[PDB]
Design a protein around this ligand. Structure first.
Ligand SMILES: Nc1ncnc2c1ncn2[C@@H]1O[C@H](COP(=O)(O)OP(=O)(O)O)[C@@H](O)[C@H]1O
Ligand SMILES: Nc1ncnc2c1ncn2[C@@H]1O[C@H](COP(=O)(O)OP(=O)(O)O)[C@@H](O)[C@H]1O
Ligand SMILES: [Mg+2]
Ligand SMILES: [Mg+2]
Ligand SMILES: [Mg+2]
Ligand SMILES: [Mg+2]
Lengths: 540, 99, 147, 525, 77, 96, 364, 105
C-alpha cells in the first residue's frame, strides 16, 4: 500500500516513472485520513493535560540540553521536534492562535483533535470527508453566532480597571505565576493601559520592555513607568543617583569628528602637528562645554566614548552612560519626553528629556549593575522587571505576562467577553444540537459530531481537576438547559458554585471565535488531504 | 531499573591508565585519518610554447631518486620542517615520476 | 550611464564646496545628456549595457522607453531590422542614425512578457515567426521544420 | 494514546517523550540524586569533595561549597539542571545557603514522591506547600531579631555570623582568626556593598594561620627602572591615560613630506608632545603616579628623571581599588590640576611575600578597600580558603545591608516546621498531609546536620521538636558535644535574608518541578 | 507499517487488481507471438546453455521461472 | 527491505523481433567462417588446444567444431548439425 | 635530578592525593627552598599512620585535631633545640651550604660551590637590617662545556648577546650607555610617507638620512661613551648598517637585541640609566666600568663580561659549566638549593642539627 | 490601495505619528544616510579647518536632502534604498513617516 507502484511493464522492459520511485513512499485513500487523524489525536491527547488552572506543565529540552518548563501551548508545540506533517500543521495552528490572539493556544489543539476524532467515526460510517468538513463549517458558523449572542461587554476605562484585572487573572490562573496572581494581573493591566492609543487603536508591544534578572523573589516583580537599562555610569567615581535629571540623548560618540568618506589629513610640518593636537583638545573641550551649556544633568550616548571625554564629563559633574542600544535609546527618548540629537551642534534645552530619578541598581553579590530611569512626567513607554529563584520560572513568567498583555490588548480591541470554564463551549454545543435537530439528516451527524467535539473542553477541565468528566459535564449541561444561564461551567477550583459570572472567570469573545474558526479550517484542511508522498529516505 | 543519576564518581579514577593508553592510540588514528582525508573527499605561434623544447634539452643537464615513504611517515614528514609535492600511486605514473 | 575613465577614476576632493557640488553637477550633466538625446525626437532607447538608476529616472521624466538587450547579436539584429546605428557613446543620434519602427509596445503572450518591434510595411531586413504550442519539444520540432 | 505509544511515529530520529509516571520518576530520581550528592557537606561536621576534571588540563578542585560542586558536574537530568540553576541563583543572591536550599528542595521532592505514591494530585500538594510556605515565612519573620541600633551588639552579631558561616569550611581550624579577619575587612568597607573592593591575594607557602588582612593596601605591579622604590608621605595621582606611543585620535591623519629632515622634525614634535604631557602631569605636585594602561620607555624615563614613582598597567579593578583606598580621582586630562584630588598615604615600599615582590601602600587616607593575603600549603587549600572567605564576606555584607538575624543550628527550621504543623493540624483534606510533608522536610534539614556528625539524629531532632512545642523558641543543635542548647547564649547566629531566600527558593523550585507531567527531549546535536 | 502490525507488505484496492492484470498480460504476451500458422518458435536457455526450441505454450510456461502467483495461476491453467 | 515484486524471476532476459533473427543468422555465419578455409584438397590444418592440456591438430570440420565452446544457441545448433552429419555418413561435416 | 619538587613536578601523577603532595612540595620549595623530599615523606608517613588510626574506629576529625596538637608541641620542641646564629659567622653559613649540597651530584665540588653560594647571598643583601633575600638578584647563566670546577662568581654581569662590532673587543675604562631608541632612518608613530617628484629630492632624501644617522652617532660619541647597549626593537630596525658603520668608525662596541626584561638587572648591576631619546642622552647617565671584554669559553661559545664597576650594584652572576646539559641543570638546582638555605638563615636566624636528630627527638 | 509589511525601522521610528488624514507621499529611490560620496572618492586636506569643513559639508549634504524632502510638503516618505537613523530622527522631529528598504514591487 506504499512504495509507489511496481510494474516493470507488461513486456518485462524497465518502467521508471518518478525519480527514485523505488524508495519513495505514498499513502492513499481512507488509510491516509486515518493516519492523520491518529497523529492529530496523539498530539491533542498530549496537550490535553495542560488545560485549566489544574493543568500540568511540560519540561522541554532542546538540542543543546537547555531545559524549558512551560504551560504555554504554542511554546510547547514549537519546542517539540516532530516529523509528522500533520503534527507540523497542528504546531502551525498553535502558532497562528498565538500570533492572532496570544491566549488559547492549547484549546485550539484539543478542539482540532476532538473534531478529527469524531470525523474518524463519521468516516467509518461511510461519509465523504468533504461532507464532514461542510457540516463542521456550518456548525462553526452557528457556534460563532451563538457566541456573539451570549457575549457581554465590559468597560475598558482607566478609572475602573476591575473587569480588566479579572480577565488578566483568569488568563494567569493556569500559569505558575498564580502565587502572585493579582499582582501580575495588576501590573499587566497597568502596562497595557499605559502604552496604548485610546481610540481602540493598536497597542505596540515595542513600548513594553520585559526583562528578567535572577535572584530576589517572584513577588518582587514590579512595573516601572520608565526604562531600565543593562548599562551603568561610565566613570566608577560618578555619582550613583541623579534626581530631577535633564537627560541629553545623543547618537554621536564623544570622539573627534571623522568623515564617512575615505580621507587623508596631511601633516607637513611641526606647526601642522601642533595645530592637530590643539584641534583635538579643543574639540573635546568644545563638545563637553556644548553639552554643559544646555543645562543637562546627565548625558546618554549610544556609541561609547574615550578617556578624555569620560574624565571631562566627571570633572563637570555630568553623569553619563555609554553604549546604550538603539531600542533602549528610543525607549528612553519616548519615556523622558526628549528628542534624539545626532550631534552636539544641534543640542538645545528644548530637546532635553526629563526624568524624576535615575539610579544605579545593585543585585547582591554579583557585581552586575543596571540603570533605572523612572518618575517620568508623562511616560508613554513602560518596562516590566521580573525576578525569581531561577531563570526557568523567569522565562515562564515572561511568557505568562506576555499572555496577559495580549489578553488585555484583545479587550482593548473589542470589549465583548464570554465566561470561561467550559460554559461557553457547553452553550455553543447546545445551540449546535438545537440547530441540528431542525436540519436535514445528512449533515445532522456532522453537526452532532461538532457539538461532541466542543464538549471536550469541559471534559478536559473536569478530568484535570479530579472530577468525573461525563457526570459533571452532563449535570452542568442539564442545569444550563433547565435555567437559561450560559455562565455555568466546570468548577475547577472547587469554589462551591458553577456560576462563572460570580467566579469572575472571563475570557475574550474574540479569543473563542478565533479558536473555533482556526480549528474548523485546520480540520477542514486536514480532512481534505487523501494522499501523502514522502521521500522515505530517512536521511541523516 | 532505576537510579539513572549514577554519579560514577571515582569509578573512572581507577581506569585512567587503560583509558588514556587507548585514547593515545585513538587520537593517533584520528590524526592519521584526518591527514589522509585532508586531500581526499575535499575535492576528490606563441601559443605553442616555443620555449618548451629549449627547456626540454636544458633540463637534462643535471641523478638521485624521489623519497619513497610507513603510515606515520606521511604524518611526520609534513608535521616537522616550503613547497612540497607528494605523489600518490600504486604499482602514466612512471612518466610523471620521471618528470 | 555616464562614461567613466579606462585606467582608474578617483574623485579628488580638496575643499568642502567641491564635495557639496560634485553630485549635483554630475546629475545636472547627465540630465543635460538625456535631454539632448530626447530633443532629437527620439522616444525609444535601446542599450546593450546596464542602466543607471538616475539615468532611468531622467528618462522616465522625459517619457522615453528603455529596452535593454544583453546579447550583442540581438542588438545587431535590432539595428538591422529598424535601420539604426549602434552608437558607442551617449551622443544624441544624427538624422541618418535614428531608427524608425511603426509601433513598439510591451505585450503579454500566454504568460510571457515580450517587447514587440512591429512594422506595418510587408518588408524589412528581419522577420520573426512566433511559435505557439502545448509542449517545448513540439515547438522545437516545429522550429526544426521551419529551418 | 501517547505520541511514543502510537502505531504511527511522530518524532524525529533520536527525539522521545516521557509521560506522567516516567517523567515524575526521572525528575524525582534526578533531584534526590542531587540532594544526596550535595548533602554530607552540611553543618559543622560536613566533609569536602574532590572535583577531578576529565579535560585536557585535568583541573583538580577541593571544595565544601554546594554551588561550586553543583555547577562543575556533567548533568543530563533536567530536574537536576533545575536544582543546579537554583543553587547558582542562591549563590548569586547571597554567599551562603546553596547546600541548604538544594537539600531542602530534594527533601521536598522526596516527600512529594511519597505523596504521589499515596494517590494525591500534585495540585493539592502544591496548594498545601504554598500555605506551608506562607506560614513558615511569617513565623521566621516574626522570629527575626534586629541589633543594628547597638554598635557593640551589632559587632557581636557580625562575629557570631562570620563564625557560623566559617564553621563548616576548611577555615574552621582557625575559626577565630579568620572570623576577626573577615569582620574587620567588611567593616573597613564603611557600608559599601562592593565586595570587589576587597582583594584576596593567594600566595603559596606558609600556614593557613599566616593569612592576614593588611593594614593598608597591596599591589602586584612593578615600578619603572630609574624611579624611587620608597616614598614617604606620598601624594598619589591615579590616571587612565594612554602615555604609550600616544596618537592623535584623528584616524585619517598622516605625515606627508618631501624630505627626511621634516620626518625627524615631526618625530621630535611627537616626543615634545609626550614631554609636555608628562610636565603637565608633574605640575600636580605628585610623588607616585599610577596609570591604568602601559607606560612606555620615554614617559617612564621622564618620570625617573623627576624622581616620581610610576606604576603601570594597574587594571580597572586596580585603579578603582587605589581610588577607594587613597581617595584620589581617576583622571584622563591634566589641564586643571586644582580640580583633581590626589590620593595620600603615609608610606609606599616593596614587600617580599613568598618569592614575589609587591608594592605596599601603608597609612592610607580612606582605606575603603582591602587586600587579604592567603597563605596555604597547596593550591587546593588556597582556592577553598578563598571560596570560604568569599562566602563569609558576602554574608557579612548582607548582614550590614540588612541587620535582621535569625538563630542557626536548626532552630529556624524547627520553628518554621512547628508553625507549619500548627497550620496543618488546623486544615482538613490532603493539604494537611502535604503541609505535614513540608514540615518533615524542614525537620530533615537539621536531621541531616546531626547525621553528618555521627550523633543520634533522631533523638536530637525529637528533643528539638518537643522543646519548640513547649515554647522554647531558641533551642537548637549544640554541636560541641551532641546535645541541645540556647543559641542566644551559644551565639550561633545567621542572617535572616539567607534563611528567607533558602526557604523561598526551595519552595519555588519544588513547586515548578512538581508541576511537570511530561518530559520531551529533542534530538541531541 | 501501522496499527495492523503484520510483518509483510499489503496491497489493497485498484493496486492489487492492476498488478494481477499486469501479470496476466505479461504471461499472455510471452506466448502471444506463437499462435496460428504464422506463429514462430522460441528458444529457451536453461542458464547452463541447454536449448529448448518450442512452440507449445505448455512447455514454455512450464520451463519459465514465474514468481507472481497470478502468473502461476495462468501457467497452471 | 521490500524486495521488488515482478512477474518473472530476475536474470531472465528476453529478446524479440528482427534482432533475434539477425543474431541467429550472424551466429551461423560465424560458425561457417570458422571452418570455411578447411574445405578442399588444398585445405590448411588447424591446431586446437584441449582444455585438459592436449593438442588437436586436425583438418576435419567436425573435429574442429566439437572442440570449441560457444554461448549463442544458434552456434550450438550448428555444432549439433555438424555432429549429426559426422555420425550419419562420416564425412561432409564442413560442407553442410 | 635529586630535588624532590622537581621529581614530583616532572612525572604526572594523575591522583588527587599525589597532586596535592606535589603542590605541598612546591609550597615547601617556595617558603624554604630545600627539604622538599622530607615534607612529602612526612605527609606520606602521617597518612600511613592515619590508615591504622581509621581502622581502629577513630573519626577523621579527632585525628586532625590531635595532629594539630602534635604539630604545635613539635614546633615548640624544635624551637627548644634551636641555636641562635649571626650572619657575621661565616663558618655556620658554609656548613649550612655544605649540608645542603651533600645530597646532590655536586657534593664532590662542594669546596668550590658552598663558598660561592655564601658569597653570592652575602653580596646581594645588607648584612644587617635585612629580613629577606631576593634571589632574582643572583643571575644564573648556564654555558655548556668544561666541568663543574669551572663555575665562576662574576661580580659584574655576563651577556649572552654577541658584539655587532666585529673587530673591537675588550674595552678598558668603559663608559657603558644603555639606549631604548633606534639608530635608523627617522620614523614617526603616526604613519608617514616621503613623496619624491624630482631627482634632486632623491639625492636630498638619502643625503639627509645619512646626515641624521651621523648626527645621532656624533651625539652619542660626544658624551664619552665607548660601549653601547641597544634594547631589542621589533617595530623598526634598532641598529642600521650605516649606524653600525659610523659607530665602528667612532671605536665603540655595539651590543644589540637586549631584552626588555633584563633592563632593570643591567641598570642595577652597572648604574646606567636608560635613555629613550637622544635629547636626554648625557654623560651623567653612563655606567663607568673597569673592563668590558668578550671572552671565549675554549670554543664552547662567547660571553661578554663587564667586571669591575664604579659604585657597584647589589647583584651577582654565577656561571655554571659542565660536560653535558643534564649535570648543568642539576648543578643549577643544587646551587639554588644552597642559596635558598642561606636565605632561610637570613630570616628566622636559628640553626639546628641535621642527620635525622630533630626527627628522632620529635618522635621521642 | 497598497499595503506592505514594516521594513526594519531604525531608532527613533516609534516617535513618528502612525496616522495621517491627507498625506502626500514622496516615493523615492534615494539612500538617506551619512556615507561616502562615492566608493572611489578620496578627500585630501592638510588643515584642521578643512577637516571641519569637510565634516560639516557631509552633514550639510544630508541635511540639504532632508530639507528638500521636508519642504516638498510630503508627510510620508518611502525609499527603495536604506534610510538611516539620522534621517529617521529628522523625520520624527517633523512629525513625518519614513520607511526604507521598501521592495520594488
Ligand atoms: N478559575 C477557573 N475556573 C474554571 N476554568 C478556568 C479558570 N481559569 C481558566 N479556566 C479555563 O481553562 C481553559 C484553559 O485556559 P489556559 O490553560 O489558561 O490557556 P489555554 O486556553 O491556552 O489552555 C480556558 O478555556 C478557561 O475557560
Ligand atoms: N556552629 C554551628 N552549630 C550549629 N549549626 C551550625 C553551625 N555552623 C553552621 N551550622 C548550620 O549548618 C548549616 C549549613 O551551613 P554551611 O554548610 O556553612 O553553608 P550552607 O548553608 O551553604 O550549607 C546552616 O543552616 C547552619 O544552621
Ligand atoms: Mg490561557
Ligand atoms: Mg556555609
Ligand atoms: Mg570429406
Ligand atoms: Mg637538601
Amino acid at each position: 500500500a506504499s512504495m509507489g507502484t511496481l510494474a516493470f511493464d507488461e513486456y518485462g522492459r524497465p518502467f521508471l516513472i518518478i525519480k527514485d520511485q523505488d524508495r519513495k513512499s505514498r499513502l492513499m485513500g481512507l488509510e491516509a485520513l486515518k493516519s492523520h487523524i491518529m497523529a492529530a489525536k496523539a498530539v491533542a491527547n498530549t496537550m490535553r493535560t495542560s488545560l485549566g488552572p489544574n493543568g500540568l506543565d511540560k519540561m522541554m529540552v532542546d538540542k543543546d540540553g537547555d531545559v524549558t518548563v512551560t504551560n504555554d501551548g504554542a511554546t510547547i508545540l514549537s519546542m517539540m521536534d516532530v516529523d509528522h506533517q500533520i503534527a507540523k500543521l497542528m504546531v502551525e495552528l498553535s502558532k497562528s492562535q498565538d500570533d492572532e490572539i496570544g491566549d488559547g493556544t492549547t484549546g485550539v489543539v484539543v478542539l482540532a483533535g476532538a473534531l478529527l476524532e469524531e470525523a474518524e467515526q463519521l468516516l467509518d460510517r461511510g461519509i465523504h470527508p468533504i461532507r464532514i468538513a461542510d457540516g463542521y463549517e456550518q456548525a462553526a458558523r452557528v457556534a460563532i453566532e451563538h457566541l456573539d449572542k451570549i457575549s457581554d461587554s465590559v468597560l475598558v476605562d482607566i478609572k475602573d480597571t476591575e473587569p480588566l484585572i479579572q480577565t488578566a487573572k483568569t488568563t494567569l490562573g493556569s500559569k505558575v505565576v498564580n502565587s502572585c496572581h493579582r499582582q501580575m494581573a495588576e501590573i499587566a493591566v497597568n502596562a497595557v493601559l499605559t502604552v496604548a492609543d485610546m481610540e481602540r487603536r493598536d497597542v505596540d508591544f515595542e513600548l513594553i520592555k520585559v526583562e528578567g534578572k535572577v535572584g530576589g523573589r517572584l513577588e518582587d516583580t514590579k512595573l516601572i513607568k520608565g526604562v531600565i537599562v543593562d548599562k551603568d555610569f561610565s566613570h566608577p567615581q560618578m555619582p550613583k543617583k541623579v534626581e530631577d535629571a535633564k537627560i541629553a540623548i545623543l547618537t554621536c560618540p564623544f570622539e573627534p569628528p571623522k568623515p564617512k568618506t575615505k580621507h587623508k589629513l596631511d601633516v607637513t610640518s611641526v606647526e601642522d602637528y601642533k595645530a592637530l593636537q590643539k584641534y583635538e583638545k579643543e574639540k573635546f573641550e568644545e563638545m563637553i562645554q556644548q553639552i554643559k551649556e544646555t543645562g543637562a544633568n546627565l548625558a546618554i550616548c549610544q556609541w561609547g566614548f574615550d578617556d578624555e571625554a569620560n574624565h571631562l564629563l566627571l570633572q563637570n559633574n555630568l553623569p553619563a552612560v555609554r553604549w546604550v542600544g538603539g531600542p533602549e535609546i528610543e525607549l528612553i527618548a519616548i519615556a523622558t519626553g526628549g528628542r534624539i540629537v545626532p550631534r552636539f551642534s544641534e543640542l538645545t534645552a528644548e530637546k532635553l528629556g526629563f526624568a524624576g530619578l535615575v539610579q544605579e541598581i545593585s543585585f547582591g553579590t554579583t557585581k552586575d549593575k543596571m540603570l533605572v530611569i523612572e518618575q517620568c512626567k508623562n511616560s508613554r513607554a513602560v518596562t516590566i522587571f521580573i525576578r525569581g529563584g531561577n531563570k526557568m520560572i523567569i522565562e515562564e513568567a515572561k511568557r505568562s505576562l506576555h499572555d496577559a498583555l495580549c489578553v488585555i490588548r484583545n479587550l482593548i480591541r473589542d470589549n465583548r467577553v464570554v465566561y470561561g470554564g467550559g460554559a461557553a463551549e457547553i452553550s455553543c454545543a447546545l445551540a449546535v444540537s438545537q440547530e441540528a435537530d431542525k436540519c436535514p439528516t445528512l449533515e445532522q451527524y456532522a453537526m452532532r459530531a461538532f457539538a461532541d467535539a466542543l464538549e471536550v473542553i469541559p471534559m478536559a477541565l473536569s478530568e484535570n481537576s479530579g472530577m468525573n468528566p461525563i457526570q459533571t459535564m452532563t449535570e452542568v449541561r442539564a442545569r444550563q438547559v433547565k435555567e437559561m444561564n450560559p455562565a455555568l461551567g466546570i468548577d475547577c477550583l472547587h469554589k462551591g458554585t458553577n456560576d462563572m459570572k460570580q467566579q469572575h472567570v472571563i475570557e475574550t469573545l474574540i479569543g473563542k471565535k478565533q479558536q473555533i474558526s482556526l480549528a474548523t479550517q485546520m480540520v477542514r484542511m486536514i480532512l481534505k488531504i487523501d494522499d501523502i508522498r514522502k521521500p522515505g529516505e530517512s536521511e541523516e | 531499573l532505576a537510579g539513572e543519576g549514577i554519579s560514577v564518581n571515582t569509578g573512572p579514577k581507577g581506569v585512567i591508565n587503560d583509558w588514556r593508553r587507548f585514547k593515545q592510540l585513538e587520537t593517533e588514528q584520528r590524526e592519521e585519518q584526518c591527514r589522509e582525508m585532508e586531500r581526499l573527499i575535499k575535492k576528490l605561434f606563441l601559443q605553442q610554447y616555443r620555449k618548451q623544447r629549449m627547456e626540454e634539452m636544458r633540463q637534462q643537464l643535471h641523478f638521485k631518486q624521489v623519497f619513497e615513504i610507513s603510515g606515520e611517515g606521511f604524518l611526520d614528514m609534513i608535521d616537522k620542517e616550503i613547497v612540497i609535492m607528494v605523489h600518490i600511486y600504486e604499482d602514466g605514473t612512471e612518466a610523471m615520476n620521471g618528470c | 550611464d555616464g562614461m567613466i575613465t579606462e585606467t582608474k577614476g578617483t574623485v579628488l576632493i580638496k575643499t568642502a564646496e567641491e564635495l557639496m557640488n560634485f553630485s549635483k553637477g554630475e546629475e545636472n550633466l547627465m540630465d543635460a545628456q538625456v535631454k539632448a538625446i530626447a530633443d532629437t525626437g527620439a522616444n525609444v532607447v535601446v542599450t546593450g549595457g546596464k542602466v543607471a538608476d538616475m539615468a532611468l529616472h531622467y528618462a522616465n521624466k522625459y517619457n522615453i522607453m528603455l529596452v535593454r538587450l544583453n546579447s550583442k547579436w540581438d542588438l545587431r539584429r535590432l539595428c538591422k531590422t529598424v535601420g539604426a546605428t549602434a552608437l558607442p557613446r551617449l551622443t544624441p543620434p544624427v538624422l541618418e542614425e535614428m531608427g524608425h519602427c511603426d509601433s513598439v509596445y510591451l505585450s503579454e503572450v500566454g504568460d510571457t512578457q515580450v517587447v514587440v518591434f512591429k512594422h506595418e510595411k510587408e518588408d524589412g531586413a528581419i522577420s520573426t515567426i512566433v511559435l505557439r504550442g502545448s509542449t517545448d519539444n513540439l515547438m522545437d520540432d516545429i522550429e526544426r521544420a521551419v529551418d | 494514546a501517547s505520541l511514543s505509544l502510537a502505531p504511527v511515529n511522530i518524532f524525529k530520529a533520536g527525539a522521545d517523550e516521557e509521560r506522567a509516571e516516567t517523567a515524575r520518576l526521572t525528575s524525582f530520581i534526578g533531584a534526590i540524586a542531587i540532594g544526596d550528592l550535595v548533602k554530607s557537606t552540611l553543618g559543622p561536621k560536613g566533609m569536602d569533595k574532590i572535583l577531578l576534571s576529565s579535560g585536557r588540563d585535568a583541573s583538580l578542585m577541593v571544595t565544601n561549597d554546594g554551588a561550586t560542586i553543583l555547577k562543575n558536574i556533567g548533568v543530563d537530568n533536567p530536574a537536576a539542571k533545575v536544582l543546579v540553576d537554583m543553587s547558582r541563583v542562591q549563590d548569586d543572591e547571597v554567599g551562603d545557603g546553596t547546600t541548604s536550599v538544594t537539600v531542602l528542595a530534594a527533601e521536598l521532592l522526596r516527600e512529594a514522591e511519597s505523596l504521589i505514591a499515596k494517590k494525591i494530585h500534585p495540585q493539592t500538594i502544591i496548594a498545601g506547600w504554598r500555605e506551608a510556605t506562607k506560614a513558615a515565612r511569617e513565623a521566621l519573620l516574626s522570629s527575626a531579631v534586629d541589633h543594628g541600633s547597638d554598635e557593640v551588639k551589632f559587632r557581636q552579631d557580625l562575629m557570631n555570623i562570620a563564625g557560623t558561616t566559617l564553621s563548616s569550611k576548611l577555615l574552621t581550624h582557625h575559626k577565630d582568626h579568620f572570623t576577626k579577619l573577615a569582620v574587620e575587612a567588611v567593616l573597613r568597607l564603611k557600608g559599601s556593598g562592593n565586595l570587589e573592593a576587597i582583594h584576596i591575594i593567594k600566595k603559596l607557602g606558609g600556614s593557613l594561620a599566616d593569612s592576614y588582612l593588611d593594614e593598608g593596601f597591596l599591589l602586584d605591579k612593578k615600578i619603572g627602572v630609574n624611579q624611587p622604590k620608597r616614598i614617604e608621605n606620598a601624594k598619589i595621582l591615579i590616571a587612565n591615560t594612554g602615555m604609550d606611543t600616544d596618537k592623535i585620535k584623528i584616524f585619517g591623519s598622516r605625515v606627508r613630506v618631501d624630505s627626511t629632515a621634516k620626518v625627524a622634525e615631526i618625530e621630535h614634535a611627537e616626543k615634545e608632545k609626550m614631554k609636555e604631557k608628562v610636565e603637565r602631569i608633574l605640575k600636580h605636585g605628585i610623588n607616585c603616579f599610577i596609570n591604568r594602561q602601559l607606560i612606555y620607555n620615554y614617559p617612564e624615563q621622564l618620570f625617573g628623571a623627576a624622581g616620581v614613582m610610576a606604576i603601570e598597567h594597574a587594571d580597572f579593578a586596580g585603579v578603582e581599588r587605589l581610588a577607594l583606598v587613597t581617595g584620589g580621582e581617576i583622571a584622563s586630562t591634566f589641564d586643571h590640576p586644582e580640580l583633581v584630588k590626589l590620593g595620600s598615604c603615609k608610606l609606599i615600599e616593596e614587600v617580599m611575600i613568598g618569592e614575589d615582590k609587591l608594592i605596599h601602600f601603608s597609612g592610607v587616607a580612606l582605606g575603603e578597600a582591602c587586600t587579604i593575603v592567603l597563605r596555604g600549603a597547596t593550591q587546593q587549600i588556597l582556592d577553598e580558603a578563598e571560596r570560604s572567605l568569599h562566602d563569609a564576606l558576602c554574608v557579612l555584607a548582607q548582614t550590614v545591608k540588612d541587620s535582621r538575624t535569625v538563630y542557626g543550628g536548626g532552630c529556624s527550621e524547627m520553628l518554621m516546621a512547628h508553625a507549619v504543623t500548627q497550620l496543618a493540624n488546623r486544615t482538613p483534606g490532603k493539604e494537611a498531609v502535604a503541609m505535614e510533608s513540608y514540615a518533615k522536610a524542614l525537620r530533615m534539614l537539621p536531621t541531616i546536620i546531626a547525621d553528618n556528625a555521627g550523633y543520634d539524629s533522631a533523638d536530637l531532632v525529637a528533643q528539638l521538636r518537643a522543646a519548640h512545642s513547649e515554647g522554647n523558641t531558641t533551642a537548637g543543635l549544640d554541636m560541641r558535644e551532641g546535645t541541645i542548647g540556647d543559641m542566644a547564649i551559644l551565639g550561633i547566629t545567621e542572617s535572616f535574608q539567607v534563611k528567607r531566600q533558602v526557604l523561598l527558593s526551595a519552595a519555588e523550585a519544588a513547586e515548578v518541578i512538581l508541576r511537570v507531567d511530561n518530559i520531551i527531549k529533542a534530538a541531541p546535536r | 507499517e501501522g496499527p495492523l502490525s503484520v510483518f509483510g507488505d499489503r496491497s489493497t484496492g485498484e493496486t492489487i487488481r492492476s498488478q494481477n492484470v499486469m501479470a496476466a498480460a505479461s504471461i499472455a504476451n510471452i506466448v502471444k507471438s506463437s499462435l496460428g500458422p504464422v506463429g514462430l518458435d522460441k528458444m529457451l536457455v536453461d542458464d547452463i546453455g541447454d536449448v529448448t526450441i518450442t512452440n507449445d505454450g505448455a512447455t514454455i510456461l512450464k520451463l519459465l521461472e514465474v514468481e507472481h502467483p497470478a502468473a502461476k495461476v495462468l501457467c497452471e491453467l | 527491505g521490500h524486495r521488488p515484486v515482478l512477474v518473472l524471476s530476475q536474470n531472465t532476459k528476453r529478446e524479440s523481433g528482427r534482432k533475434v533473427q539477425s543474431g541467429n543468422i550472424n551466429a551461423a555465419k560465424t560458425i561457417a567462417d570458422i571452418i570455411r578455409t578447411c574445405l578442399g584438397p588444398k585445405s590448411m590444418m588447424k591446431m586446437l588446444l584441449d582444455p585438459m592440456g592436449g593438442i588437436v591438430m586436425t583438418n576435419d570440420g567436425n573435429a574442429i567444431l566439437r572442440e570449441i565452446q560457444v554461448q549463442h544457441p544458434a552456434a550450438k545448433s550448428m555444432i549439433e548439425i555438424s555432429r549429426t552429419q559426422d555420425e550419419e555418413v562420416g564425412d561432409g561435416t564442413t560442407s553442410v | 635530578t635529586n630535588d624532590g619538587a622537581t621529581i614530583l613536578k616532572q612525572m604526572q601523577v594523575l591522583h588527587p592525593a599525589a597532586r596535592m603532595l606535589v603542590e605541598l612540595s612546591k609550597a615547601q620549595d617556595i617558603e624554604a627552598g630545600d627539604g622538599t623530599t622530607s615534607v612529602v615523606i612526612i605527609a606520606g608517613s602521617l597518612l600511613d599512620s592515619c590508615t591504622k588510626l581509621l581502622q581502629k574506629g577513630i573519626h577523621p576529625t579527632i585525628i586532625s585535631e590531635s595532629f594539630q596538637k602534635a604539630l604545635e608541641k613539635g614546633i615548640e620542641i624544635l624551637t627548644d633545640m634551636s641555636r641562635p646564629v649571626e650572619l657575621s659567622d661565616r663558618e655556620t653559613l658554609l656548613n649550612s651550604a655544605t649540608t645542603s649540597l651533600n645530597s646532590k651530584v655536586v657534593s664532590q665540588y662542594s669546596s668550590l660551590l658552598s663558598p660561592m653560594s655564601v658569597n653570592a647571598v652575602m653580596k646581594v643583601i645588607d648584612p644587617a637590617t635585612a629580613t629577606s633575600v631576593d634571589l632574582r638578584d643572583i643571575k644564573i647563566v648556564k654555558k655548556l662545556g668544561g666541568t663543574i670546577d669551572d663555575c665562576e662568581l662574576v661580580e659584574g654581569l655576563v651577556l649572552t648577546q654577541k658584539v655587532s662590532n666585529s673587530g673591537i673587543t675588550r674595552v678598558e675604562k668603559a663608559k657603558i650607555g644603555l639606549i631604548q631608541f633606534c639608530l635608523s632612518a627617522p620614523k614617526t608613530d603616526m604613519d608617514n610617507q616621503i613623496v619624491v617628484s624630482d631627482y634632486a629630492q632623491m639625492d636630498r632624501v638619502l643625503r639627509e638620512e645619512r646626515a641624521y644617522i651621523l648626527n645621532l652617532v656624533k651625539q652619542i660619541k660626544k658624551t664619552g661613551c665607548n660601549v653601547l647597549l641597544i634594547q631589542k626593537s621589533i617595530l623598526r630596525d634598532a641598529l642600521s648598517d650605516l649606524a653600525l658603520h659610523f659607530l665602528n668608525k667612532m671605536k665603540i662596541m655595539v651590543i644589540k637585541d637586549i631584552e626588555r626584561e633584563d633592563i632593570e638587572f643591567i641598570c642595577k648591576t652597572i648604574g646606567t640609566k636608560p635613555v629613550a631619546h637622544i635629547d636626554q642622552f648625557t654623560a651623567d647617565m653612563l655606567g663607568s666600568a673597569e673592563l668590558a671584554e668578550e671572552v671565549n669559553l675554549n670554543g664552547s661559545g662567547k660571553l661578554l663580561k663587564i667586571t669591575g664597576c664604579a659604585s657597584p650594584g647589589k647583584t651577582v652572576t654565577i656561571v655554571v659549566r659542565g660536560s653535558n646539559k643534564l649535570v648543568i641543570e642539576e648543578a643549577e638546582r643544587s646551587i639554588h638549593d644552597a642559596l635558598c638555605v642561606i636565605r632561610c638563615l637570613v630570616k628566622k636566624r636559628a640553626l639546628i642539627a641535621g642527620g635525622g636528630a630533630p626527627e628522632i627527638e620529635l618522635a621521642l | 490601495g497598497v499595503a506592505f509589511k514594516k521594513t526594519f525601522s531604525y531608532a527613533g521610528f516609534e516617535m513618528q505619528p502612525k496616522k495621517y488624514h491627507n498625506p502626500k507621499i514622496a516615493l523615492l529611490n534615494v539612500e538617506l544616510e551619512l556615507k561616502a560620496e562615492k566608493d572611489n572618492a578620496e578627500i585630501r586636506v592638510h588643515t584642521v579647518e578643512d577637516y571641519q569643513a569637510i565634516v560639516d559639508a557631509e552633514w550639510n549634504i544630508l541635511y540639504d536632502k532632508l530639507e528638500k524632502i521636508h519642504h516638498s510638503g510630503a508627510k510620508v516618505v518611502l525609499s527603495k534604498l536604506p534610510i538611516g537613523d539620522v534621517a529617521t530622527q529628522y523625520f520624527a522631529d517633523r512629525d513625518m513617516f519614513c520607511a526604507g528598504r521598501v521592495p520594488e514591487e
